[PDB]
Amino acid sequence: AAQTNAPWGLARISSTSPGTSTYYYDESAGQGSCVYVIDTGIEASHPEFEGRAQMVKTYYYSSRDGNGHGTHCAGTVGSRTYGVAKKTQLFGVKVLDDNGSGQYSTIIAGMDFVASDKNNRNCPKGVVASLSLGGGYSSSVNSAAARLQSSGVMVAVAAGNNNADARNYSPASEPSVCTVGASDRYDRRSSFSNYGSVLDIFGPGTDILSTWIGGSTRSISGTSMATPHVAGLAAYLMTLGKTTAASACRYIADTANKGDLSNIPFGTVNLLAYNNYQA
Binding of Ca(2+) 2: at which residues? Predict the structure, then answer.
C-alpha cells in the first residue's frame, strides 16, 4: 500500500533516505495485533481511530484524555492517517493525569494491568505496549517494565527529553525493553533526545503530526512521539509474522537504517526504525 502525502515520520520509516513523502506498507497494516497506549488516555471517539480504539483502564476519576498526549501517541501507533499500524487494535490505559503526570506507583500498576488484561483480549498476532513517559531512575519501574515484556508484550519506552544519558531515567534504562530515541526530518538526533548505550533504536520525533483531542490534529515533538512509531512498527512486523514480541526490538535493530543519523554521541546506537517493505 501507499499513503500519499503522509506525515514525514511515516514516510521516513518506509524509506532509506530522508526527504520522502509517501509511506509504503504491507496492506495487513497490523491487523490482528494489539497495542496498549499507556498514557493520558485516547479520544477513542476520534474518526481517525475508526472505532479501533477503546479505553480499558483508568486510575483517575475519568478515562477521557483531557490532555491530548495519549491521543497523539495512539494516533501515531495506529490512526488511519498518522499511524504506522493502520489496522491495529488500540487499548487505552490512563496512567497519566490530564497534566501529563502520574506517580510511579500508578504507572507500575498500569503495566501489571496490561500483562494480565491481554488475556482478556483477542490479539492472535501479538501484543505491544507503548510507554511515552518516564522520570528519574527507579528499579521498581524498571522491573515493572521487564515483567510486562516477560509476560509476552513487546514493550517500547521513550528515552526521555533531557539531552542526557538515558541510564538515569526509567523505564528508559531497563535493558530488556525497547528504548527509543528521537530524530528529526533531516536525520539529526533531536536536540532534546536522550542518548546512551541503553538506547536500542531511533524513531521520528520532531514535528510529528498526529491526532489530538477534540477530534483535531497537531504537530508536537518528543521521544514520546518516536516511541509509538516503533510500537506501531512492532505490531506491523508481528502481524506479518517476521518477529515475536520477545524478538521484535532486536529485529527492528537488525533491520534498521544503520549509520544514517547525525549528532549521535559516541557509544549510542545509530539505528533508525525501518520497515524494509518491498512493494
Answer: 16, 260
